[PDB]
């Protein structure tokens, strides 16, 4: 638990690829 509370800003943006992933697979 204490090792991810400082990591977690790693995690922030694998999470949120989820978001951008749709828009580089709808323009090819």
């Given at each position: 638990?204490?090792?991810e509370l400082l990591e977690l800003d790693k995690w922030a943006s694998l999470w949120n690829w989820?978001?951008?992933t749709?828009?580089?697979w709808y323009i090819k």
């Open positions: 638990n204490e090792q989820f978001n951008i749709n828009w580089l």
